[PDB]
Design a protein around this nucleic acid. Structure first.
Lengths: 46, 77, 89, 102, 63
RNA sequence: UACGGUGCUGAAGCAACAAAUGCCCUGCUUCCAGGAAAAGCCUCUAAGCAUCAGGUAACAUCAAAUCGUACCCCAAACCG
RNA sequence: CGAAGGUGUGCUGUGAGGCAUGCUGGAGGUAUCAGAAGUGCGAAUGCUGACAUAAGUAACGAUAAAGCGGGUGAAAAGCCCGCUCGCCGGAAGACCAAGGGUUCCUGUCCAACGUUAAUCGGGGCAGGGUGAGUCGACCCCUAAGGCGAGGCCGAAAGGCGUAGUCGAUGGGAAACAGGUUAAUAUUCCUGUACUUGGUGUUACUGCGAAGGGGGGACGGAGAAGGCUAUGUUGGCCGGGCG
RNA sequence: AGGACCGAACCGACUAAUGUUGAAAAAUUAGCGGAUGACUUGUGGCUGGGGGUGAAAGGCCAAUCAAACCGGGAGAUAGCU
RNA sequence: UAAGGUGAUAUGAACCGUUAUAACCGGCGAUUUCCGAAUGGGGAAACCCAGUGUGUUUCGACACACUAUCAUUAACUGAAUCCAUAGGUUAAUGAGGCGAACCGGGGGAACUGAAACAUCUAAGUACCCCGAGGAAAAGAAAUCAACCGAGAUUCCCCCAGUAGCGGCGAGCGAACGGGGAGCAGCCCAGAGCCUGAAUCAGUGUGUGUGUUAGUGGAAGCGUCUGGAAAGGCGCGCGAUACAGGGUGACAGCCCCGUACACAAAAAUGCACAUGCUGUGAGCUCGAUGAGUAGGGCGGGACACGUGGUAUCCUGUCUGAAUAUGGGGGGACCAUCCUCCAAGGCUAAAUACUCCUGACUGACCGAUAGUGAACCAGUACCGUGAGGGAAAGGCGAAAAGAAC
């Protein structure tokens, strides 16, 4: 049965990448929360 | 935005009260109107976005005064 | 110039292996571990400056050091560049 | 600012070898000294092949603390506390309880 | 070398001795990665001497 | 002969017939539901240039950098 | 010349409890009288951890199938080698993209992993291995679409959008055959080639763009012709006569 | 020529059986329907929560849908256990 | 300061110095790859491609500088359109993002209570956005009072759960005035006397006080137990030091410390004096903030829900007087009272802790305390936003079991 995660790096980095966050205001807010909590891998930019 | 360029009338908010005093949030909008004015000092036609109260201010004091005050606010005319 | 400093900086180590010794005896090509950026022309200029030899071409490749485990700590090793230099006869 | 230094001759004060005395070989960063002939520990040395191979039960000189040892005054016949006086421009050690510079 | 001993020096000689230090560095790291150099520590101090020379290259020339 | 293979020597190396969904075919014929865009390519001049500069052909020399390349890929290595 | 804690035993009180003490332990505990409380657990389909029961029970993951000999080792149905058997063969074969990231090869190991054993393995550990002018990326060009100076609009945030600039799933030039290592090969080697730029030299001459024009440039279905990949047979050559 | 016919790939999911602490949180086996189109598919976009999308079932929107998920008001409130 | 070092698991090999440029510490410098506001364009973050000009060319390429967008100024230019603007170029100056809480403004809920619920409550709270500071806001009466008077703002204890508001329900809840903390006044709307006059920002010099390295720092022995004494017994000594931590069991006299006395080459905090740059000081006189106050309609805030409801703010439509004048004294009117709006500046008393050091605890001691005493926002789960654990102890010393 075809599962829900049929992966590809282009859609992954285009949606959840670093620059797609940084180009948006709420993306920069998400990155600031991720840095204030202090996660090691910040986003999937890899 | 929806700002009187001469007077500064920001669209304010308010409560709409019906007959049974049921509150509903609403917005008050000024009487903004784009106008082409004539200045004999520049000897041409300028475009402003004013309200009717602002238009009466243009009527009372000179347009060369309001333009210098607009430049004092650093705005566009 | 820092160009001389660059070509003195590029070459790190001569490489010793079984494929290295085979290619060395066959086609007179040496194998060297070089710096990370370390382009083709800079490698060729550096070997022709420092070993005082002749060079035909240079084949470059970037190899990824394996992701090892020590106890529980995962450690990816370094990322080095290897170049086969084909000397003249 | 350390009271006991390298080529001193000291006595220990707390230990099984109390009252005995020897020279200091080494002062480590931990706050422990090594005194010759005083601390003796039997090491069961597991010999490695690609080096000299003793095997056997070997003897080494373990550590005892700096606080335990004390500098032998070598005139009195027992231990003494030491202080830092200012003799000519280098700051120097001196034995307390009699005006003697080491 | 010792710091004042490089303070008295002159800039073209500083550059030639920089390049001699770098060539010395290269011979040492080549012999080290070949299997030679019982004394490894030489390599380390050679790097320090390079640093010292380059420090004067930003002060004997100009800040 | 490590015993697995290395190194040596190598004759013939044509014809007929069948033949595709492959190439001619980014064709031909027909149908209505009328079937992407810009560049590299070819040509025309404008400002300007006019001994030149360029351009064409010939000849010589040089360069073509950098990144991926191992392995699975209808699976024990991908998603479950 | 032995505290708390642990574990017994014996006295004691109406009860929560207390006291003495054997043994383990190996450095803290605290009278009396007051004070403050995260102050007393059997249940909350309570929470976390350990362990029970069913139980040495079901199951061991396609009904393609195994059998023997020789090897290695402490041990062989499973590993290596050999000989038969059996299964797929428009795949259960050969390559790739996407997606994984060392899983590839060699030596070494069997405590954990393998629904059993394991000397084996995609497991542990170390070492080795990914060679490009021509294949692909990057680069030139654009579709859907994204961003977007000015601009317009919007309480702020921001929304849309012009010039532009990005965006392959499309358009643009170039290399084949053979050989080779345990692991790479259209990349290394042998032989034979081609492309696009740069500079200079020689000879003929108007070049010049972002502007114009052609070209790129395009649907489905049908049908036939020419061919080839490829296969069958005969010849040719080598070996055989069972 | 055909939203033509029979029928593989491909897409589905009508019947029965086996499954039900499975081999699998939707399958396998033997049959079945469409198979030149209102088809199917690879890649890359776009629409979003009282909103999207819908050859329309209140169906799907990351195994969650008469109003997703995540954090926050929040230790909501509970005449109930 | 210094006789010991090469950060730790984590031992080694190789060397450095021991009387002074071995190491460690402290100020100031230099270097500071690539991403990142990311700033030359682009992008799938840590990468791809440039261009302009210089000067090095071994002639194939090098290395460095700059090149975003806006605001403001300045200068060359500069269209339809004569002029002249818009526009364009160049330079200079500034802005940009990150950050825990507090503050001010722009927006702004609902669950809940009312034992239903719509007015109300929750609450201008949560959250979103903008902006700045070490605090921010306010702030110098067109104020309160009562015929007595006070003097800007802010904050705390009262007044006071009081007058009031309110489906007169649930609930919300003042002020006047009293006691404290802290104290501060000004300038423009303008002219003649005046130009370093009473100040404040920014520079140096001078002194002191602190900060960033540090130094000295007291006083004891014997005997039994025991593995070891710091315990017991005995005999002394220090204390402006008996805070604390360690040492083979509990140490004032063993070590580091503490009280105490100091100490800065350099760089800066603070106030103080001494000079530059700007600035006016103080008088005599005239003025005294117009689409504004007030109004009609519709909202909002003051405890106050349109009520009999004064006051302020306003979206809309109007519209005075201008000190012979005008506001306010809780409908409103007359007299009295006090003040002069339509222009601004201002320290302290106040809320806060991302962080730095000391010090405290009838706070916790590994299922507790932060989620994390340990290489924890880690392993793992999710496309994602997000969620998120488990896990301390040998000994005094590894003397970690030779054979």
């Amino acid at each position: 049965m075809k599962r829900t995660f049929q992966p590809s790096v282009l859609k992954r980095n285009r949606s959840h990448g670093f620059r797609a966050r940084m180009a948006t205001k709420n993306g920069r807010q998400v990155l600031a929360r991720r840095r204030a909590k202090g996660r090691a891998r910040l986003t999937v930019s890899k | 935005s929806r700002v009187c360029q001469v007077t500064g009338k920001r669209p304010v908010t308010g409560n709409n009260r019906s007959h049974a005093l049921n509150a509903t949030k609403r917005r008050f909008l000024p009487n903004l109107h784009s106008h082409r004015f004539w200045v004999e000092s520049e000897k041409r036609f300028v475009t402003l976005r004013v309200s009717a109260k602002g238009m009466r201010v243009i009527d009372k004091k000179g347009i060369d005064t309001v333009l210098a005050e607009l430049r004092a606010r650093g705005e566009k005319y | 110039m820092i160009r001389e400093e660059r070509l003195l900086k590029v070459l790190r180590a001569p490489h010793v292996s079984e494929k290295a010794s085979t290619a060395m005896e066959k086609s007179n090509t040496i194998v060297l571990k070089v710096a990370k950026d370390a382009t083709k022309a800079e490698i060729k200029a550096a070997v022709q400056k420092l070993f005082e030899v002749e060079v035909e071409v240079v084949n470059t490749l970037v190899v990824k050091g394996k992701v090892k485990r020590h106890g529980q700590r995962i450690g990816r090793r370094s990322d080095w560049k290897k170049a086969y230099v084909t000397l003249k006869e | 600012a350390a009271k006991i230094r390298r080529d001193d001759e000291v006595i220990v004060l707390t230990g099984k070898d109390k009252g005995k005395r020897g020279k200091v070989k080494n002062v480590l960063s931990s706050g422990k000294v090594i005194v010759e002939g005083i601390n003796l520990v039997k090491k069961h040395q597991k010999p490695v092949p690609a080096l000299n191979q003793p095997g056997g039960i070997v003897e080494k000189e373990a550590a005892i603390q700096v606080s335990n040892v004390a500098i032998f005054n070598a005139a009195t016949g027992k231990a003494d506390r030491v202080g830092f006086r200012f003799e000519d421009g280098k700051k120097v050690r001196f034995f307390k309880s009699n005006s003697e510079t080491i | 070398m010792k710091a004042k001993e490089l303070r008295e020096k002159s800039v073209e000689e500083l550059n030639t001795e920089l390049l001699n230090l770098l060539r010395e560095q290269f011979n040492l790291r080549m012999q080290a990665a070949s299997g030679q150099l019982q004394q490894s520590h030489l390599l380390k101090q050679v790097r320090r001497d390079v640093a010292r020379v380059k420090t004067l290259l930003n002060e004997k020339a100009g800040a």
